[PDB]
Ligand binder design. Structure first.
Ligand SMILES: COc1ccc2c(c1)CCN(C(=O)Cc1cc(=O)[nH]o1)[C@H]2C(=O)Nc1ccc(C(C)(C)C)c(F)c1
Length: 215
């Protein structure tokens, strides 16, 4: 665990994310101008809550599938025992999706990428969960303020998954050793990119799963 050793891991995780990001940043950023029309928004609003759940759950599960593939090609993750792998994914994958979602959020007009175009939070009125949606938009807004780089998401979301303090882990030391190397990679990269400032500005680790309440 020296200089090139850790830099191998940085590049290792950044490749792993690049290959499992589902939606390209270049796509999301260009698509920002393509906003839903008032007709289309009403169109979405008239739908049943059930059709909105179905649509939403589809894409979100699909997202979780991509997060698993990211987890699978993190070195060390496969060496963990069956039980420990699933514990980490059960407590992490939704938190990872939530972070990854900030790339799909235009902070200028307060809109999100959903089914082809960008819409505001009034788009999901059918769900009747305005409280939860606001907080999701809030959380995305603050992470947009930091201008999160692709590599930074890659590294941070690796650290979201690989947590030694998850309840019900058999080989805690095996996870510990893994979490530690990823912290080193994360901290080394921020140092290397003059981006240490963001550490202090990241949401606390009990704020991610405070949103997963009526979930
Ligand atoms: C990087 O993480 C993301 C970000 C957005 C989306 C996804 C994954 C999955 C595909 N998707 C789609 O809309 C489906 C589709 C794919 C494509 O090429 N074109 O369209 C988006 C998405 O699901 N957005 C959405 C935004 C708010 C919500 C909340 C209701 C939680 C606010 C939500 F459930 C989903």
């Amino acid at each position: 665990a020296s200089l090139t050793e850790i830099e191998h891991l940085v590049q290792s995780v950044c490749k792993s994310y690049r290959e499992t990001c589902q939606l390209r940043l270049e796509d999301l950023l260009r698509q920002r101008s393509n906003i839903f029309s008032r007709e289309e928004v009403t169109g979405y609003q008239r739908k049943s809550m059930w059709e909105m759940w179905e649509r939403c759950a589809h894409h979100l599960t699909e997202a979780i599938q991509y997060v698993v593939e990211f987890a699978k090609r993190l070195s060390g993750f496969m060496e963990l025992c069956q039980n420990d792998q699933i514990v980490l994914l059960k407590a992490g994958a939704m938190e990872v999706v939530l972070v990854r979602m900030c790339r799909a959020y235009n902070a200028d007009n307060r809109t999100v990428f959903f089914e082809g175009k960008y819409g505001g939070m009034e788009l999901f009125r059918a769900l009747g969960c305005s409280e939860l949606i606001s907080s999701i938009f809030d959380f995305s807004h603050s992470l947009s303020a930091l201008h999160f780089s692709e590599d930074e998401i890659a590294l941070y979301t690796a650290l979201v998954l690989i947590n030694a303090h998850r309840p019900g882990l058999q080989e805690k030391r095996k996870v510990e050793q893994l979490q530690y190397n990823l912290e080193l990679a994360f901290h080394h990269h921020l140092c290397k990119t003059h981006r240490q400032s963001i550490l202090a500005k990241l949401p606390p680790k009990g704020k991610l799963r405070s949103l997963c309440s009526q979930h």
